[PDB]
Amino acid sequence: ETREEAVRELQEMVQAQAASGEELAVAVAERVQEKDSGFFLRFIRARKFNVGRAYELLRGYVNFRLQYPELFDSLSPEAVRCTIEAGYPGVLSSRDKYGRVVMLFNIENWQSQEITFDEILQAYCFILEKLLENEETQINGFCIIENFKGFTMQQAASLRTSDLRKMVDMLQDSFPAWFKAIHFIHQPWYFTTTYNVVKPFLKSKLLERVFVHGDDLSGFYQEIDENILPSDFGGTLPKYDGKAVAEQLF
Numbered sequence: 001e002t003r004e005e006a007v008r009e010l011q012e013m014v015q016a017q018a019a020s021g022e023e024l025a026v027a028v029a030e031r032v033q034e035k036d037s038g039f040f041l042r043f044i045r046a047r048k049f050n051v052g053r054a055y056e057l058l059r060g061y062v063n064f065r066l067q068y069p070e071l072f073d074s075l076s077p078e079a080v081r082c083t084i085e086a087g088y089p090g091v092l093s094s095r096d097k098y099g100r101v102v103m104l105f106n107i108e109n110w111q112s113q114e115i116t117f118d119e120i121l122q123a124y125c126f127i128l129e130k131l132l133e134n135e136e137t138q139i140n141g142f143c144i145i146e147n148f149k150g151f152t153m154q155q156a157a158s159l160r161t162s163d164l165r166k167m168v169d170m171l172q173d174s175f176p177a178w179f180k181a182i183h184f185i186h187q188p189w190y191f192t193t194t195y196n197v198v199k200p201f202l203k204s205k206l207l208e209r210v211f212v213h214g215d216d217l218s219g220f221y222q223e224i225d226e227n228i229l230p231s232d233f234g235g236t237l238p239k240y241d242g243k244a245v246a247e248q249l250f
């Protein structure tokens, strides 16, 4: 069958490229040796069975793990569960009109000293790994809704550029085939500085996927159905509770 052959070919390419000794190629081979066929199919299907292109995606996925080992080295599924239970980030039970998974983040009362930026990116990665087991999601991908209504100057001033860059690379290196859009709502005037800091690190393809809505959600609701969003993201569903998602994943 085509799938098993495609997976085999990808594996062969991984080995062939590693044989050159090129640093990244060698790391890919080492980092995927425990993976099942399902893992390789995510990349293959995301690139319409084009093996070389699937391999290019795989390189970025591994590169992210090489550059940010602190996110992966001592990952504890139990600790990640607690982060998710606390609502960071969230996940909608329904897909949007594009058939995408919708992820959520509400910065209001986020306290970086209780739940770190890194801990939240670990939760993103943990969730995405699970979600990407699903074959429709492997094609449709996901989006992110950021409610910045409660973004304080204190939070703004404390955001580390290195952390913002880590998030950029998560979307641009680890998950570019699947990250489709990010929608910022209710952001304050000083969001402009924060955006300006990240801008130089964004490829043009990624910039095209960033939307900033302020207080006018008319266009936002054309994209994400109001009737599938929690009340704290402008929707008609109950206030987002991380416990439900947590129980579904674990």
Ligand SMILES: CC1=C(/C=C/C(C)=C\C=C/C(C)=C/C=O)C(C)(C)CCC1
Pocket (backbone or CB within 6 Å): 105, 107, 110, 116, 117, 120, 164, 165, 167, 168, 182, 194, 195, 198, 202, 210
């Ligand atoms: C503008 C913009 C970004 C900004 C993200 C910021 C501003 C905050 C992220 C969330 C935080 C604060 C999470 C805390 O745990 C990205 C997504 C990096 C890249 C695309 C453009």
